[PDB]
Design a protein around this nucleic acid. Structure first.
Length: 98
RNA sequence: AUACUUACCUGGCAGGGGAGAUACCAUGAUCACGAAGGUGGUUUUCCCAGGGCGAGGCUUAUCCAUUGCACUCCGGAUGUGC
């Protein structure tokens, strides 16, 4: 609930292949700012989810506000801030601990 | 259909890995203890050829499970090709 560089997206369509999903998330979410990375896995724990990492928290906050509920492959997107900093954010900060 | 008989038409030949090495066994080698080797085994190194076993992995769809906070791939099942 507290703003973050990374947004967490769930309720994604699980049928969509990994590169396609990264691709289509990039298209939609660059409109709000510079993206450092989009992480997708199709494993059991991680399917249906993506982390979009932005350079600025303000882009993240605007991306979260605007896209909340957005129809994406026949499913509304659920978006939150990530609970924890993404490794590349934390290393940028010197906050990083293994 | 099978076996033989006669007539007619036809008709090449040759083979089954190869090459090394073997200290050990057999061949109980005809000259005062002995050949070397060769041959046949055994073991082994090359040239390797066809099979056996299929651990693992690649690919794609049905069903089942999953609403999951990660940043070291990575749920289950079943089937065509690899």
């Amino acid at each position: 609930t507290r703003p973050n560089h990374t947004i967490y997206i769930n309720n994604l369509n699980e049928k969509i292949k990994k590169d396609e999903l990264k691709k289509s998330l990039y298209a939609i979410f660059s409109q709000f700012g510079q993206i450092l990375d989009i992480l997708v896995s199709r494993s059991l724990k991680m399917r249906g989810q993506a982390f979009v990492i932005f350079k600025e928290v303000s882009s993240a906050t605007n991306a979260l506000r605007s896209m909340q509920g957005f129809p994406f492959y026949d499913k509304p997107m659920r978006i939150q801030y990530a609970k924890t900093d993404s490794d590349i954010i934390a290393k940028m900060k010197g906050t990083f601990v293994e």
